[PDB]
Each structure stands twice: as C-alpha cells, then as structure tokens.
Design a protein around this ligand. Structure first.
Ligand code: HEM
Ligand code: HEM
Lengths: 153, 153
C-alpha cells in the first residue's frame, strides 16, 4: 500500500499530466508501442503505423492516449479517496484499539440485523446479500491494511 | 466483489441510515455489546456499563455510534465510487480486448518512463516509487476483477 504522502504525490503528478494530457498520452502510447511492439497488435486502428513519426502524426492515437490517461487518472483519484478514509481507521484499530477482524464481523452482523429490523421493506434478501458482501469487502480491505502493519488480528 | 447493481442496493439502504444515524448507531452498539460482551471490554470508556438502560442513558455511547456509522458510510461510498470506474475497465479489458496483466505492466512502465522524461525537475525517486506502487495497486485491482470474471489475465 501507499502511505498518505505517497498518494498525495501521485495526485500532484497527475495534475501535471492533466495540464498536457494530449502530449502525455501520445508519448505513453508511442513508448509502449516502440518498446513492446507486440502490444500494438491489439489495436486494429493503430497497427498499420510502422514508425515513431507515423505514430506522432496520428490524431486518433493521440486521442486514445488521452482516453487512457483520463480513465487511469480517475481510478487513481478514487483509490486515493478511499484509502484516505480506510487507512486512518485501519491504523487506529490495529495499533491503538487492537480490534480483531472477528470483532469487525460481529459488528457487521449487528449492522445487518439493525438494518433489517428498522427497514424490512427496503432490506429484502437481495439488499441484505449486497450489504453482507459490502461489509465483508470492507473487512477484507481492513485485513489487508492490518497485514501491511504486521497486526495479525 | 460486488456487481454494480449490488453496490447500488448498498448505497440505497445507507440513505435510510443517514436519516437517523445516531439511533441506528446506538442500536448497533448495544446489539454488539449484548451479543458479544468481550467487544465491550475493548472500550475503556464504556466497559463499566451493565444494563440496557445504562447503555441507552450514555451520551457518549450514542455519540460514538454516530461516529462509527458516519465513518463506515463514507468508506462504503468511496469504495463504490472506485468500483464504478474500475469495473467497466476490467470488464472490457478481460472480455473484449483480452489484455494480459503483463501488458498492463508494460504500459505502467511506459507511464513512469514518460513522467520521468517530461518532468526532469520533479519526479524524483520517492514520487516515482509512489507511482510504481499506485500502478501495481491498480494492476492488482484489475487482476482481482479478472479473477471474478473468470478471465485468466
Ligand atoms: C493504464 C492502463 C489502461 C487503461 C486506463 C486503459 C483504458 C482504456 C479505455 C478507457 C478504453 C476505451 C473504453 C474501453 O474499451 O474500456 C480502452 C480501450 C482499449 N484498450 Fe485500454 N487501457 C489500458 C491499457 C491497455 C493496454 C496495455 C492495452 C493493449 C496492449 C489495451 C488495449 C485496448 C484496446 C485494444 C482498446 C480498444 C481500442 C479501440 O479500438 O478503440 N489497453 N482502454
Ligand atoms: C464498522 C466497523 C467500525 C468502524 C467504521 C469504526 C469506526 C471508528 C471511529 C470512526 C472511531 C473514532 C476514530 C478512531 O479512533 O479511529 C473509532 C474508535 C474506536 N473503535 Fe471503532 N469502528 C469499527 C469497529 C470497531 C469494533 C468492532 C470495535 C471493538 C469491539 C471498535 C473499537 C473502537 C474503540 C475502542 C475506539 C476508541 C473509542 C473511544 O474511546 O472513544 N471499533 N472507531
């Protein structure tokens, strides 16, 4: 995992990518295609380009580079946002409060019960199965942080 | 992993919690502490509480319930938001484009190469490490989705 400061450095450099996304995206693809020509075969639109100059002249290759970097940027920013909330919680519950994963399962069962008790008409079998999976996914994400911290839990 | 529909059902029900977060949080904690008394022992501030009246009478237990549910709902929403961007990308790259994890490694390395190249002043060893990890974290996130979709990446 990244630390808090590492995620902030990822976000800072992506701000620089976005100030010239077309140039960055073009350069990334050319670098991939020249360094690893077998990749270029996946692109039915691009595989006729034989030289770096030909690649640089393609408005379509440039447009696809912008699509890739925009998609990646968005995923990185959403990961960073989730990590900035998950990491402080894992940190405190591993090192200060020393909470086993099993106890997070017990509280997840209590949440599911309270939601079902309070909102039966909004919390049928499908909704309940979805929430059970979301809280298991949450525990799994905390468990991965506990591991990085060496807390067995 | 949850499907998009499952994430939407989670966020739909969480809307109901938000309407009375403190009441939900009080009920969740009392359910937890009554079902699993060893969890109450982890709270130095609450472990003296012996009866349900005493637990309902506690100003701080109720405030803590709202803290806990507020923090979980923010993590769930941020996880859903990340999944809503990552899942479509993994689905197309697994099923339509059929891109191996190793090609995702090649593009990761191209991005780090181009960032190093176009920002000579800025992108030093630490920042480059942070991006390396962030792209491996991304490849790992895709690889987990690939598994779910039964695509060998
Ligand atoms: C950082 C990694 C990557 C990101 C963010 C990314 C993103 C995207 C996006 C947003 C699209 C258009 C929508 C879609 O079909 O999902 C796309 C299409 C595509 N991607 Fe990727 N991609 C990545 C890596 C790769 C790699 C390494 C390859 C091949 C070696 C690949 C091959 C393709 C192909 C063949 C298409 C369809 C192109 C077309 O005909 O229009 N991608 N990618
Ligand atoms: C859905 C799962 C949980 C969430 C979202 C959650 C969230 C929080 C929050 C936001 C705080 C205050 C900030 C902090 O210290 O990190 C906190 C404190 C605490 N949590 Fe949790 N928690 C969870 C589960 C548990 C469980 C299962 C236990 C124990 C059985 C636990 C024991 C504690 C303790 C002892 C504190 C310090 C409380 C104080 O004295 O004020 N947590 N938790």
């Amino acid at each position: 995992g990244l630390s808090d400061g590492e995620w902030q450095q990822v976000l800072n450099v992506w701000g620089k990518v976005e100030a010239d996304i077309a140039g960055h995206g073009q350069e990334v693809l050319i670098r991939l295609f020249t360094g690893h020509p077998e990749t270029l075969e996946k692109f039915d639109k691009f595989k006729h380009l034989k030289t770096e100059a030909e690649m640089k002249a393609s408005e379509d290759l440039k447009k696809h580079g912008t699509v890739v970097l925009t998609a990646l940027g968005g995923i990185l920013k959403k990961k960073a946002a989730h990590e900035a909330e998950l990491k402080p919680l894992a940190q405190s519950h591993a090192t200060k409060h020393k909470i086993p994963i099993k106890y997070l399962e017990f509280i997840s069962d209590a949440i599911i019960h309270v939601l079902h008790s309070k909102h039966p008409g909004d919390f049928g079998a499908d909704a309940q199965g979805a929430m059970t999976k979301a809280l298991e996914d949450f525990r799994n994400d905390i468990a991965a942080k506990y591991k990085e911290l060496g807390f067995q839990g």
